[PDB]
Design an enzyme around this catalytic site. Structure first.
Site, mmCIF file in Angstrom:
data_model
loop_
_atom_site.group_PDB
_atom_site.id
_atom_site.type_symbol
_atom_site.label_atom_id
_atom_site.label_comp_id
_atom_site.label_asym_id
_atom_site.label_seq_id
_atom_site.Cartn_x
_atom_site.Cartn_y
_atom_site.Cartn_z
ATOM 1 N N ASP C 141 0.804 -1.193 0.000
ATOM 2 C CA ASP C 141 0.000 0.000 0.000
ATOM 3 C C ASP C 141 0.845 1.253 0.000
ATOM 4 N N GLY C 166 15.459 -3.575 5.663
ATOM 5 C CA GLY C 166 16.346 -4.105 4.617
ATOM 6 C C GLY C 166 17.597 -4.714 5.338
ATOM 7 N N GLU C 189 6.425 -1.010 11.684
ATOM 8 C CA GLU C 189 7.749 -1.282 11.138
ATOM 9 C C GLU C 189 8.213 -2.655 11.621
HETATM 10 C C1 LIG Z 1 -6.136 -5.021 15.488
HETATM 11 C C2 LIG Z 1 -7.453 -4.513 14.815
HETATM 12 C C3 LIG Z 1 -7.642 -5.154 13.437
HETATM 13 C C4 LIG Z 1 -8.640 -4.880 15.706
HETATM 14 O O1 LIG Z 1 -8.924 -6.221 15.536
HETATM 15 P P1 LIG Z 1 -10.022 -6.893 16.484
HETATM 16 O O2 LIG Z 1 -9.770 -8.339 16.389
HETATM 17 O O3 LIG Z 1 -11.320 -6.307 16.060
HETATM 18 O O4 LIG Z 1 -9.609 -6.459 17.972
HETATM 19 P P2 LIG Z 1 -10.742 -6.021 19.063
HETATM 20 O O5 LIG Z 1 -11.406 -4.760 18.674
HETATM 21 O O6 LIG Z 1 -11.570 -7.166 19.482
HETATM 22 O O7 LIG Z 1 -9.790 -5.785 20.303
HETATM 23 C C5 LIG Z 1 -8.992 -6.832 20.830
HETATM 24 C C6 LIG Z 1 -8.238 -6.283 22.016
HETATM 25 O O8 LIG Z 1 -7.106 -5.491 21.583
HETATM 26 C C7 LIG Z 1 -7.381 -4.099 21.668
HETATM 27 N N1 LIG Z 1 -7.211 -3.574 20.320
HETATM 28 C C8 LIG Z 1 -7.459 -3.925 19.018
HETATM 29 N N2 LIG Z 1 -6.937 -3.103 18.140
HETATM 30 C C9 LIG Z 1 -6.337 -2.125 18.923
HETATM 31 C C10 LIG Z 1 -5.676 -0.921 18.600
HETATM 32 N N3 LIG Z 1 -5.463 -0.503 17.342
HETATM 33 N N4 LIG Z 1 -5.249 -0.156 19.627
HETATM 34 C C11 LIG Z 1 -5.441 -0.573 20.890
HETATM 35 N N5 LIG Z 1 -6.058 -1.669 21.317
HETATM 36 C C12 LIG Z 1 -6.509 -2.392 20.271
HETATM 37 C C13 LIG Z 1 -8.796 -3.971 22.176
HETATM 38 O O9 LIG Z 1 -8.838 -2.918 23.073
HETATM 39 C C14 LIG Z 1 -9.020 -5.302 22.865
HETATM 40 O O10 LIG Z 1 -8.459 -5.264 24.147
HETATM 41 P P3 LIG Z 1 -9.311 -6.052 25.233
HETATM 42 O O11 LIG Z 1 -9.355 -7.478 24.825
HETATM 43 O O12 LIG Z 1 -8.479 -5.889 26.436
HETATM 44 O O13 LIG Z 1 -10.588 -5.322 25.414
HETATM 45 C C15 LIG Z 1 -7.431 -2.985 14.597
HETATM 46 O O14 LIG Z 1 -6.997 -2.598 15.899
HETATM 47 C C16 LIG Z 1 -6.427 -2.631 13.478
HETATM 48 O O15 LIG Z 1 -5.216 -2.739 13.659
HETATM 49 N N6 LIG Z 1 -6.913 -2.228 12.300
HETATM 50 C C17 LIG Z 1 -6.009 -1.941 11.187
HETATM 51 C C18 LIG Z 1 -6.213 -0.590 10.533
HETATM 52 C C19 LIG Z 1 -5.231 -0.356 9.389
HETATM 53 O O16 LIG Z 1 -4.011 -0.499 9.535
HETATM 54 N N7 LIG Z 1 -5.788 0.022 8.243
HETATM 55 C C20 LIG Z 1 -5.008 0.214 7.050
HETATM 56 C C21 LIG Z 1 -5.217 1.485 6.251
HETATM 57 S S1 LIG Z 1 -3.997 1.451 4.893
HETATM 58 C C1 LIG Z 2 17.463 1.116 20.213
HETATM 59 C C2 LIG Z 2 17.925 -0.172 19.457
HETATM 60 C C3 LIG Z 2 19.044 0.155 18.462
HETATM 61 C C4 LIG Z 2 18.440 -1.188 20.475
HETATM 62 O O1 LIG Z 2 19.710 -0.815 20.872
HETATM 63 P P1 LIG Z 2 20.406 -1.626 22.061
HETATM 64 O O2 LIG Z 2 21.480 -0.744 22.543
HETATM 65 O O3 LIG Z 2 20.705 -2.969 21.500
HETATM 66 O O4 LIG Z 2 19.307 -1.678 23.228
HETATM 67 P P2 LIG Z 2 19.078 -3.037 24.104
HETATM 68 O O5 LIG Z 2 18.526 -4.127 23.273
HETATM 69 O O6 LIG Z 2 20.223 -3.320 24.986
HETATM 70 O O7 LIG Z 2 17.977 -2.489 25.098
HETATM 71 C C5 LIG Z 2 18.242 -1.397 25.963
HETATM 72 C C6 LIG Z 2 17.005 -1.154 26.791
HETATM 73 O O8 LIG Z 2 16.005 -0.444 26.023
HETATM 74 C C7 LIG Z 2 14.988 -1.321 25.555
HETATM 75 N N1 LIG Z 2 14.995 -1.203 24.103
HETATM 76 C C8 LIG Z 2 15.880 -1.070 23.065
HETATM 77 N N2 LIG Z 2 15.308 -0.844 21.907
HETATM 78 C C9 LIG Z 2 13.950 -0.868 22.202
HETATM 79 C C10 LIG Z 2 12.800 -0.774 21.391
HETATM 80 N N3 LIG Z 2 12.838 -0.584 20.063
HETATM 81 N N4 LIG Z 2 11.602 -0.893 22.003
HETATM 82 C C11 LIG Z 2 11.552 -1.066 23.335
HETATM 83 N N5 LIG Z 2 12.556 -1.185 24.195
HETATM 84 C C12 LIG Z 2 13.738 -1.103 23.550
HETATM 85 C C13 LIG Z 2 15.357 -2.703 26.036
HETATM 86 O O9 LIG Z 2 14.198 -3.344 26.434
HETATM 87 C C14 LIG Z 2 16.268 -2.409 27.210
HETATM 88 O O10 LIG Z 2 15.493 -2.123 28.342
HETATM 89 P P3 LIG Z 2 16.115 -2.687 29.691
HETATM 90 O O11 LIG Z 2 17.429 -2.028 29.893
HETATM 91 O O12 LIG Z 2 15.143 -2.206 30.687
HETATM 92 O O13 LIG Z 2 16.062 -4.166 29.624
HETATM 93 C C15 LIG Z 2 16.776 -0.801 18.643
HETATM 94 O O14 LIG Z 2 15.773 -0.786 19.658
HETATM 95 C C16 LIG Z 2 16.443 0.095 17.429
HETATM 96 O O15 LIG Z 2 15.894 1.184 17.580
HETATM 97 N N6 LIG Z 2 16.790 -0.337 16.213
HETATM 98 C C17 LIG Z 2 16.554 0.500 15.037
HETATM 99 C C18 LIG Z 2 15.815 -0.185 13.906
HETATM 100 C C19 LIG Z 2 15.598 0.748 12.719
HETATM 101 O O16 LIG Z 2 15.086 1.867 12.851
HETATM 102 N N7 LIG Z 2 15.987 0.260 11.545
HETATM 103 C C20 LIG Z 2 15.916 1.042 10.340
HETATM 104 C C21 LIG Z 2 15.297 0.410 9.109
HETATM 105 S S1 LIG Z 2 15.263 1.705 7.822
HETATM 106 N N1 LIG Z 3 17.892 0.799 5.174
HETATM 107 C C1 LIG Z 3 17.921 0.501 3.740
HETATM 108 C C2 LIG Z 3 19.035 1.243 3.065
HETATM 109 C C3 LIG Z 3 19.127 0.790 1.639
HETATM 110 C C4 LIG Z 3 20.185 1.603 0.864
HETATM 111 C C5 LIG Z 3 20.291 1.275 -0.611
HETATM 112 C C6 LIG Z 3 21.255 2.128 -1.461
HETATM 113 O O1 LIG Z 3 22.337 2.712 -1.014
HETATM 114 O O2 LIG Z 3 21.099 2.302 -2.679
HETATM 115 C C7 LIG Z 3 18.130 -0.997 3.494
HETATM 116 O O3 LIG Z 3 18.974 -1.618 4.280
HETATM 117 O O4 LIG Z 3 17.526 -1.595 2.593
HETATM 118 N N1 LIG Z 4 -5.901 0.816 1.619
HETATM 119 C C1 LIG Z 4 -6.110 1.502 0.342
HETATM 120 C C2 LIG Z 4 -5.945 0.551 -0.805
HETATM 121 C C3 LIG Z 4 -6.320 1.253 -2.076
HETATM 122 C C4 LIG Z 4 -6.061 0.355 -3.305
HETATM 123 C C5 LIG Z 4 -6.330 1.008 -4.644
HETATM 124 C C6 LIG Z 4 -5.989 0.198 -5.911
HETATM 125 O O1 LIG Z 4 -6.002 -1.107 -5.996
HETATM 126 O O2 LIG Z 4 -5.704 0.735 -6.992
HETATM 127 C C7 LIG Z 4 -7.517 2.102 0.263
HETATM 128 O O3 LIG Z 4 -8.498 1.389 0.758
HETATM 129 O O4 LIG Z 4 -7.720 3.213 -0.245
#
Ligand SMILES: CC(C)(COP(=O)(O)OP(=O)(O)OC[C@H]1O[C@@H](n2cnc3c(N)ncnc32)[C@H](O)[C@@H]1OP(=O)(O)O)[C@@H](O)C(=O)NCCC(=O)NCCS
Ligand SMILES: CC(C)(COP(=O)(O)OP(=O)(O)OC[C@H]1O[C@@H](n2cnc3c(N)ncnc32)[C@H](O)[C@@H]1OP(=O)(O)O)[C@@H](O)C(=O)NCCC(=O)NCCS
Ligand SMILES: N[C@@H](CCCCC(=O)O)C(=O)O
Ligand SMILES: N[C@@H](CCCCC(=O)O)C(=O)O
Ligand SMILES: CC(C)(COP(=O)(O)OP(=O)(O)OC[C@H]1O[C@@H](n2cnc3c(N)ncnc32)[C@H](O)[C@@H]1OP(=O)(O)O)[C@@H](O)C(=O)NCCC(=O)NCCS
Ligand SMILES: N[C@@H](CCCCC(=O)O)C(=O)O
Lengths: 274, 274, 274
Positions: C141, C166, C189
């Protein structure tokens, strides 16, 4: 329009059996007219009436049907190529037209035909899907997306990376609606027919769907499906009964004020120069 | 430069009354020069001096003024068209120039004129707005956005979908600044003049604005507006006084170490081949 | 293939010393063949065998090596220009081919050569990087990104703004994998080689990396690195030992059911018309 409505609703029932080849010229000419009307703002998928937003389900049908009646075509990008069935809105515009239409389109902003763009809006690079309606004064900031059939009010600011849910996949009953004067914070998402009432400010990283609890710390009231007009919402969590963990929720922390208004205003200097 | 500064600051005061037609050739030639200097890195909206970042407000004015003095023009995309007033940076480049400039531009990465791109940077598909400055070795990953006038240090990694706040809409006092050697995790947002000090690692899905509490679990100290050099920040929440709910905050969980360095390093093999 | 594997693994060892000029015609012709095979789906960076996903490290090497052996070239966009070393996948396609290949490419969706796109997929505007593999029925999407070498299953829905990690920068041991039939919620993500097992539903705004605790409220079990098949995951937090603050975590709230299936289904009407 009954002469269009009728044909549309007839065909929808045979949706799965219609293809770009077995479709008769009537359904084709019609579906096409209804899309041209949406493109122009003459029709809109949802509209507010008597203080209630109403969905014209049958206009959502024509949108769906356009995907069954049209065939893909190669589109020549410059460095690459595309293959799709929904024309580009601006492909035919000349300066005269852009001049009369009164909005700004920043490359590489892209809009599908069947979407309405109002005067004085600014589209930074972003996506507007078929059937959406974007009202006056609004800015769609970088990498934002206005989902199929979504309804965006006047003077709205959709921040960078914001996503407004469509109705195509997954399939939805109602469009997502953002009323006039709202500010949607960066990277936030609004989907599944939730309604953001006028003058509300959604902070960054807020995710609102039908399953999202919108908690009003002051009243203790928990909403679902809509953001009451003039609220300021930010991310939080609500605790499990056993305090074992907590789950995401949206929290209405306050009603919009001057402090808030200070950070979210529209910049008129960027709008159309009269 | 006083000969430019003067004219700029004169005009800004009449901002709302200046249009692409009533603007006199002096203000026009000037605003245009100041934009050409920003494009070249000869001037930059903010700069660090005596260990303090300083904002040249008057350069932010010229940026604003360019929107009052220039008129929109049709830009021919291939499959669509655009209508805007800020030229594309790379529209005139030939290979010679790209060869001398030393960076890589991955389609369909887009940069506006008035933004400075340094040697040895890699722009995946993303957006760099007018007046921004992107220093050496930096990668702007997919769908990231470098907001108007933002200042990005050397060797920075802005992950996919990351947004660095601009200063145009909503209007901001100071640019957002990311110092040298920082890693900003995917989908994170940094806005409203917050400063991320050198060598810091912001995890994924972290949102930092002036209202964000940056909590140091170790010291108990709560920051606002800046990330102390060498921190590792991740999302968390802080509890209400009544434990009734909790609200989002950024938590400094530790100081960068080898374990951390393992996951966020720059890949030199992707940089410019000397 | 040993005749290719061998040469590749030889060169990788001299990675830092190879350049687009001192590289001998053998390594060049080879690296190029291995990329053509990935482009075609004949080879894939990771694959499941005996219920275990396996990484062919040496195919990840060729991907890396292509950046050392190829030189940048100017690519003419229409309104701007690019300068990069990885060709566009679809640049040579004609309608015949798009017709035979059976997928839909919505402008301005972009795919690099070396990535495999399966039949019946729909690419809304988004990015697919080199070496990725996208299986049948899947929709990528708006503004989603399929990271280098990532493996996406059949019938998957990657929502708007979703990012799949990646392996290039930062450099990673294993690709990120999304098995068949998964739905990844908007703005979420998935990175650092985490595996999302088949039929799982990741909600919006969920961030999964190796450091993310995936908490199963029912069993109390905490996972790391993978989402057990058929789970529904949403954002939450876990409390500090002193209840002083809480930190982000992913929470498995339940197993997928009809209520869930109602909100995340694929829309067949948008798929290829047989
Ligand atoms: C996960 C999702 C599908 C809900 O699914 P569901 O099976 O209907 O989940 P429910 O509504 O029964 O909730 C289940 C539990 O998780 C929680 N829950 C569900 N989705 C949640 C959300 N987005 N945030 C917080 N809680 C959420 C509910 O509070 C509930 O908790 P409980 O059991 O303690 O009361 C919906 O939250 C979601 O992610 N929709 C996707 C929307 C999206 O990305 N659209 C794309 C546009 S491109
Ligand atoms: C922050 C990150 C680098 C982890 O680094 P790290 O130094 O290995 O951190 P650790 O795994 O030792 O965790 C350190 C503490 O923070 C928490 N922590 C680290 N990253 C966390 C995350 N993403 N979510 C929640 N907690 C996280 C751990 O639970 C831990 O808590 P604690 O000390 O209470 O146990 C990783 O979380 C992250 O952000 N990765 C980046 C991914 C990304 O953006 N990729 C790019 C794709 S384009
Ligand atoms: N975070 C991205 C960066 C891609 C870079 C590609 C380029 O230099 O052309 C990945 O690991 O896929
Ligand atoms: N989540 C998006 C998907 C659109 C797809 C459109 C296409 O197939 O061309 C929406 O509901 O708008
Ligand atoms: C909501 C926002 C506008 C702040 O508005 P504000 O009215 O100044 O809110 P305040 O600073 O008075 O804070 C109000 C309350 O909510 C909290 N709050 C506000 N914004 C918050 C945020 N982003 N995260 C967490 N808490 C936040 C404050 O902690 C405060 O809680 P308290 O009453 O318990 O102390 C700001 O948070 C925001 O979202 N800015 C948008 C940035 C953006 O998206 N830019 C776009 C770039 S394209
Ligand atoms: N939030 C963005 C808006 C930029 C608008 C630029 C334009 O109108 O062309 C920023 O402040 O950078």
């Amino acid at each position: 329009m009954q002469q269009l409505q009728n044909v549309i609703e007839s065909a929808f029932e045979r949706r799965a059996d219609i293809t770009p080849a077995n479709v008769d010229t009537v359904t084709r000419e019609a579906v096409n007219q209804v899309i041209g009307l949406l493109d122009s703002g003459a029709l809109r998928v949802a509209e507010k009436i008597d203080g209630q937003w109403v969905t014209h389900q049958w206009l959502k049908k024509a949108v769906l049907l356009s995907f069954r009646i049209n065939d893909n075509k190669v589109m020549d990008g410059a460095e690459t190529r595309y293959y799709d069935k929904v024309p580009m809105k601006f492909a035919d515009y000349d300066e005269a037209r852009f001049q009369k239409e009164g909005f700004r389109v920043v490359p590489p902003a892209t809009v599908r035909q069947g979407a309405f763009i109002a005067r004085n809006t600014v589209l930074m690079p972003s996506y507007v899907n078929i059937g959406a309606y974007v009202d006056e004064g609004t800015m769609v900031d970088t990498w934002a997306t206005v989902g199929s059939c979504a309804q965006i009010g006047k003077n709205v600011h959709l921040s960078g990376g914001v996503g407004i849910g469509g109705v195509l996949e997954p399939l939805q009953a109602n469009p997502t609606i953002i009323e006039d004067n709202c500010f949607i914070g960066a990277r936030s998402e609004v989907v599944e027919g939730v309604i953001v009432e006028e003058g509300s400010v959604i902070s960054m990283g807020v995710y609102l769907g039908q399953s999202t609890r919108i908690y009003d710390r002051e009243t203790g009231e928990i909403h679902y499906g809509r953001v009451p007009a003039g609220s300021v919402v930010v991310s939080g969590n609500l605790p499990s009964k056993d305090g074992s963990y907590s789950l995401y929720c949206a929290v209405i922390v306050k009603k919009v004020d001057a402090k808030t208004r200070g950070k979210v205003g529209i910049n008129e200097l960027l709008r159309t120069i009269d």
